């Protein structure tokens, strides 16, 4: 594993009364640790993982300040993108942002990230070089010039290489027991008569971390992609993850079927069968 | 830690 830290910003204009809402959440790998909501009566930045709480009050006053300021700016931005596209304040619109740093081998920036989207479709993004942008449309192009002349790119790189990398390492040491650790899937297989002459086999993977997993069914050497039913990886709600993989097989005949799971807490790719 | 505020203005879109 090569650890990373992400921040997700959601700005959203209101159709009714009220100012646009700014929600920020941050993650180290697949673990959330901080949240901020501008609806909260007196809005503050709050902890979301045990290991963060050791940080002094200076740290949280520092976060609040950042997000509060970001709320005011994202309200400006919305008006602007309302204009860029020529849209009434009738319609409700969403800006998203997703930025962070991936931690390479020498414990340094492998690559930095920053992507903006408007209404779920790609807007602007910092490139790999961390000094040029990618405008997806004519409106995004207006921002680019503005951002080139303001030299946002220079402030972005300064953070991504500098503090982002520095703080991720502080977090990675201070919660290491959970963050540096991989919890393997607890796997069992399941059987349910479809017919009459058929049955579903559900291969389970519970309580695992990180979310990265690979559940595939095999009748022989060739995959059962057609037709295996795979669900999206889901939260248990205690910080672990869940997933399952299913196929319909003839009630023969289940013998001929092996499940195969791949994780990061598994030394050898674990392989399973149904047991009557 | 999120990207902290710049010395200058926090540039919008």
């Amino acid at each position: 594993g090569s650890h990373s830290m992400r921040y997700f910003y959601t700005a959203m204009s209101r159709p009714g009364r009220g100012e646009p809402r700014f929600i920020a959440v941050g993650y180290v790998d697949d673990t959330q640790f901080v949240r901020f909501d501008s609806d909260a009566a007196s809005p503050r930045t709050e902890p979301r993982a045990p290991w963060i709480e050791q940080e002094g009050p200076e740290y949280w006053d520092r976060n609040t300040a950042i997000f509060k300021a970001n709320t005011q700016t994202y309200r400006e931005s919305l008006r602007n993108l309302r204009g860029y596209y020529n849209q009434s304040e009738a319609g409700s619109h969403i800006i998203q942002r997703m930025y962070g740093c991936d931690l390479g081998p020498d414990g340094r920036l492998l690559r930095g990230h920053d992507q903006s989207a408007y209404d779920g479709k790609d807007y602007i993004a910092l490139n790999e070089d961390l000094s040029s942008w990618t405008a997806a449309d004519t409106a995004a192009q207006i921002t680019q010039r503005k951002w080139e002349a303001a030299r946002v790119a220079e402030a972005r790189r300064a953070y991504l290489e500098g503090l982002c990398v520095e703080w991720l390492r502080r977090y990675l040491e201070n919660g290491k027991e959970t963050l540096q650790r991989a919890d393997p899937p607890k796997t069992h297989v399941t059987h349910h008569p479809v017919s009459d002459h058929e049955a579903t086999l559900r291969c389970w993977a519970l309580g695992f971390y990180p979310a990265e997993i690979t559940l595939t069914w095999q009748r022989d050497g060739e995959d059962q992609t057609q037709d295996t039913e795979l669900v999206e990886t889901r939260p248990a709600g205690d910080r672990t993850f869940q997933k399952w993989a299913a196929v319909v097989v003839p009630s023969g005949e289940e013998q001929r079927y092996t499940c195969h799971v791949q994780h990061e807490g598994l030394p050898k790719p674990l392989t399973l069968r149904w047991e009557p | 830690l999120p990207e902290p505020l710049p010395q200058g203005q926090l540039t919008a879109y």
Partner: T-cell receptor
Amino acid sequence: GVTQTPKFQVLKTGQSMTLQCAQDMNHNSMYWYRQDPGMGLRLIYYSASEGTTDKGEVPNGYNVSRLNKREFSLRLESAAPSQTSVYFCASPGLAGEYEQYFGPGTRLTVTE
Amino acid sequence: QKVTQAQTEISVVEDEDVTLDCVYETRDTTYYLFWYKQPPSGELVFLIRRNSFDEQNEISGRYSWNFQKSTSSFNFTITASQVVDSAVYFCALSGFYNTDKLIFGTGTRLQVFP
């Protein structure tokens, strides 16, 4: 750019005066420096943001008031000859080639 | 933390070359460096800003800079010096964030004579 009043001032020991600084660039940060021969620019106080202040290197005898996001204020409640100096106000950004980040500076003499 | 300009007053005649030395001290990984000119006039005119993560080569006509991050120096160099260059020169170090203290050097007076 950043403006700064007054340009010159004369004062008698014990008296007050507020140097006013103003920035129109929407910058968060505002800084106060004195200049004294062969001493460079030493910080006095600064402001991270609206309604926030922090000591510098020479905060003695100096007080500040970050009024709003536009205006910083350097206040001398009791003048002293050792405060004879040129005072510059600073508000740095990233586009220095075409935006002025320093006030003209205010010449100040404190006499007996 | 620290910005040093060991040079106090320095003299050159027209057309001659000058290199104004400047050395910094930080524990930080990211930072940028200022150069400012103070003419006999009083005001401060911007010469250059340079980020720590930038390149090394900076030739901009007569005024030129050399930023060696390993030996923590940033040296301004005027070729074909003119009487007009006569000023006090300031090196400065700062962080990128609103909370960061912009720290100045002691300065250097350059007197270009004809």
